Scaffold this active site. Structure first.
Site, mmCIF file in Angstrom:
data_model
loop_
_atom_site.group_PDB
_atom_site.id
_atom_site.type_symbol
_atom_site.label_atom_id
_atom_site.label_comp_id
_atom_site.label_asym_id
_atom_site.label_seq_id
_atom_site.Cartn_x
_atom_site.Cartn_y
_atom_site.Cartn_z
ATOM 1 N N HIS B 41 -17.223 1.434 5.538
ATOM 2 C CA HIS B 41 -16.320 2.653 5.781
ATOM 3 C C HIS B 41 -16.343 3.599 4.577
ATOM 4 O O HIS B 41 -15.468 4.441 4.705
ATOM 5 C CB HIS B 41 -14.951 1.887 5.606
ATOM 6 C CG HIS B 41 -14.224 1.461 4.525
ATOM 7 N ND1 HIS B 41 -14.102 -0.059 4.251
ATOM 8 C CD2 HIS B 41 -13.696 2.034 3.680
ATOM 9 C CE1 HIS B 41 -13.547 -0.078 3.028
ATOM 10 N NE2 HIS B 41 -13.496 1.142 2.566
ATOM 11 N N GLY B 143 -8.550 2.159 -4.365
ATOM 12 C CA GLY B 143 -9.883 2.311 -4.959
ATOM 13 C C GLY B 143 -10.470 1.135 -5.273
ATOM 14 O O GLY B 143 -11.789 1.082 -5.956
ATOM 15 N N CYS B 145 -11.799 -1.206 -3.320
ATOM 16 C CA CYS B 145 -12.650 -1.715 -2.167
ATOM 17 C C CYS B 145 -14.159 -1.695 -2.551
ATOM 18 O O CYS B 145 -14.572 -0.767 -3.557
ATOM 19 C CB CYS B 145 -12.724 -0.725 -0.910
ATOM 20 S SG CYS B 145 -11.112 -1.035 -0.067
HETATM 21 C C1 LIG Z 1 -10.007 0.023 -0.124
HETATM 22 O O1 LIG Z 1 -10.032 0.374 -1.570
HETATM 23 C C2 LIG Z 1 -10.391 1.528 0.314
HETATM 24 O O2 LIG Z 1 -11.795 1.787 0.519
HETATM 25 C C3 LIG Z 1 -8.545 -0.562 0.394
HETATM 26 C C4 LIG Z 1 -8.037 -1.638 -0.428
HETATM 27 C C5 LIG Z 1 -6.908 -1.421 -1.479
HETATM 28 C C6 LIG Z 1 -5.843 -0.411 -1.164
HETATM 29 C C7 LIG Z 1 -4.697 -0.819 -1.668
HETATM 30 N N1 LIG Z 1 -5.030 -2.228 -1.960
HETATM 31 C C8 LIG Z 1 -5.961 -2.793 -1.527
HETATM 32 O O3 LIG Z 1 -6.449 -3.669 -1.678
HETATM 33 N N2 LIG Z 1 -8.651 -0.517 1.682
HETATM 34 C C9 LIG Z 1 -7.994 0.110 2.492
HETATM 35 O O4 LIG Z 1 -7.106 1.211 2.498
HETATM 36 C C10 LIG Z 1 -8.349 -0.350 4.217
HETATM 37 C C11 LIG Z 1 -9.505 0.570 4.618
HETATM 38 C C12 LIG Z 1 -9.989 0.240 6.116
HETATM 39 C C13 LIG Z 1 -10.992 -0.631 6.022
HETATM 40 C C14 LIG Z 1 -10.330 1.393 6.888
HETATM 41 N N3 LIG Z 1 -7.136 -0.202 4.894
HETATM 42 C C15 LIG Z 1 -6.010 -1.408 4.647
HETATM 43 O O5 LIG Z 1 -6.158 -2.219 3.905
HETATM 44 C C16 LIG Z 1 -5.024 -1.237 5.512
HETATM 45 C C17 LIG Z 1 -4.514 -0.434 6.449
HETATM 46 C C18 LIG Z 1 -3.157 -0.754 6.663
HETATM 47 C C19 LIG Z 1 -2.177 -0.219 7.963
HETATM 48 O O6 LIG Z 1 -2.668 0.665 8.741
HETATM 49 C C20 LIG Z 1 -2.314 1.745 8.465
HETATM 50 C C21 LIG Z 1 -0.911 -0.637 7.776
HETATM 51 C C22 LIG Z 1 -0.618 -1.923 6.990
HETATM 52 C C23 LIG Z 1 -1.403 -2.199 5.935
HETATM 53 C C24 LIG Z 1 -2.805 -1.855 6.002
HETATM 54 N N4 LIG Z 1 -3.819 -1.964 5.092
#
Ligand SMILES: *[C@@](O)(CO)[C@H](C[C@H]1CCNC1=O)NC(=O)[C@H](CC(C)C)NC(=O)c1cc2c(OC)cccc2[nH]1
Ligand SMILES: *[C@@](O)(CO)[C@H](C[C@H]1CCNC1=O)NC(=O)[C@H](CC(C)C)NC(=O)c1cc2c(OC)cccc2[nH]1
Lengths: 303, 305
Positions: B41, B143, B145
């Site tokens: 992603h 950040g 991920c």
């Molecule tokens: C990565 O860092 C992004 O590259 C991130 C994980 C981080 C952010 C804060 N806590 C963590 O563990 N991952 C995300 O933001 C992912 C991205 C997807 C793979 C596209 N999304 C989510 O973790 C996500 C989306 C959510 C949602 O939909 C809007 C509702 C509730 C929780 C939620 N979490």
């Protein structure tokens, strides 16, 4: 989000651990520049450790009496000295992996990362707090002496602890990198007791703010308290007193959650007087005190 | 002595963390030999992540759209391919710090060390257990991920986890190093919910063996049981069923203490049916389930690397 006991990455320290052998005694050493630091009781035999006259035993030693191994290479000791309980072995080669480093003395209630080692090889990493009675609750076995504790700021490793001893109660004791023990302990083979183990109040409150930042607020209440009335109750439970500086340190956490410090103190006071029943806070059934306000800010800021 | 949640020394993994950026989206990646692994992603934009078509989004990307940096030093991307939810980028430099490694998919209940990383810089290390619902109770900020989980056996780093997601309940989800998610999760910007979690039985038993090794053995009874009987009872208390591999990894602790696996199972069954009766085990009235038999042995007989 989430809250977890977190240690610093240990790579900068791993490149400094060495093995130090003298006679039939082996433990770990810290190789920085052309000096290797290790506990001085390595020069002792099983018989000397009962009541060692370290200065007497030291003068009787030669440079070749010390086997220093860094991985596969064996380092040449070209000098030996003693700074309190820390033996300083000068070598002919400067450690090329020496990072920026400083020797510091941690304060009670402050945390640091422990790199447990055996035979000069790093085995595990975990976080510890310097308890008010100057002991720490670690995981150390035979051969762990020489393991160090550290914090990392930017690229600077701040060494604050070298391991020496496990008390009969199962907690651990050691020195700073100047060889001065934390607490009233001595490096002889004797059963030793620490002072009474009080709880680090400011850390307990920080850990409660973390629980709230993570969605748990069952312990909160509508009561409030004064600083002094809280400290009266806290001291009754063998808790360290809360100072106004402690109050100020918790400021950021108070603003973020919107709960006044003295309001958090009213919750803690109820927890101390009532207990937790069967409930848990951040997965624990006891009040955790090894998380500093800075540890909580690092992990929960902006969550 | 003493018992702690203990991570492996992280130096071998630190030298492999890098930053991967597409447009403005940045995250961490794993640089091993001349390949960089990261969550796919990274190609997405904020809006794309809502309902992404990764095959369509990837077709519009070329090697020159990928910024890979070790510190501030860019590693030129000379090839790119997608494997499940993991993006793989061939770079022109072989990581001189690459350690002996392998990719493994762990089981629920197994533990690993997490290397929390931000903008390619390691920030913290801590131990996690894969819950039976395929989440981990991590500590991850924006950040994070691309942070990986790993175990170290001898000199070999076994990578088993790469971070992708934080669920609404505050737990975390992600994949192995081949891009296959753990659990029923997908890399989309949507709130997903994990199954009801359960207690890791094999780790609870290990914890009890740890107690017996340390002289705390009040809970041992004169009963034994079958594996099928215990499993049916354990499921009534939210405990995971035991497998044959579970009994086997309990072998060393069983031999060291002299307590057969099925005998300690019968002892644990007593603890679940009648509680603790006000007593504690290893100082706690809570049964710990995030210590594997290996972790228990590791801390009762310090292994090195
Ligand atoms: C990565 O860092 C992004 O590259 C991130 C994980 C981080 C952010 C804060 N806590 C963590 O563990 N991952 C995300 O933001 C992912 C991205 C997807 C793979 C596209 N999304 C989510 O973790 C996500 C989306 C959510 C949602 O939909 C809007 C509702 C509730 C929780 C939620 N979490
Ligand atoms: C070092 O590894 C020795 O080089 C070791 C630490 C280990 C021991 C198992 N757990 C650890 O953390 N330290 C010691 O063995 C020290 C050595 C002195 C500094 C000379 N002593 C003790 O740990 C010690 C002596 C004890 C005693 O008297 C004999 C009674 C009770 C406990 C006790 N512990």
């Amino acid at each position: 989000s989430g809250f977890r006991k977190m240690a610093f990455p240990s790579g900068k320290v791993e490149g400094c651990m060495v093995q130090v052998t003298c006679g039939t005694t082996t433990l770990n050493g810290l190789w920085l520049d052309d000096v290797v630091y290790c506990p001085r009781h390595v020069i002792c035999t099983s018989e000397d450790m009962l009541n060692p006259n370290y200065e007497d035993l030291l003068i009787r030693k030669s440079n070749h009496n010390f086997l220093v191994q860094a991985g596969n290479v064996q380092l040449r000791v070209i000098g030996h000295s003693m700074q309190n309980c820390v033996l300083k072995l000068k070598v002919d080669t400067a450690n090329p992996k020496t990072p920026k480093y400083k020797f510091v003395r941690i304060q009670p209630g402050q945390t640091f990362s422990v790199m447990a080692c055996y035979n000069g090889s790093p085995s595990g990493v975990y976080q510890c707090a310097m308890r008010p009675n100057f002991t720490i609750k670690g995981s150390f076995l035979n051969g762990s002496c020489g393991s160090v504790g550290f914090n990392i700021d930017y690229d600077c490793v701040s060494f604050c602890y070298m391991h020496h001893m496990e008390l009969p109660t199962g907690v651990h004791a050691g020195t700073d990198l100047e060889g001065n023990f934390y607490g009233p302990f001595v490096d002889r083979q004797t059963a030793q007791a620490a002072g009474t183990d009080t709880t680090i109040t400011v850390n307990v409150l920080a850990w409660l703010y973390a629980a709230v930042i993570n969605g748990d607020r069952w312990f909160l209440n509508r009561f409030t308290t004064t600083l002094n009335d809280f400290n009266l109750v806290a001291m009754k439970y063998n808790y360290e007193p809360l100072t106004q500086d402690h109050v100020d340190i918790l400021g950021p956490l108070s603003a973020q959650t919107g709960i006044a410090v003295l309001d958090m103190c009213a919750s803690l006071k109820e927890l101390l007087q009532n207990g937790m029943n069967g409930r848990t806070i951040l997965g624990s059934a006891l009040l955790e005190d090894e998380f500093t306000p800075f540890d909580v800010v690092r992990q929960c800021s902006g969550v």
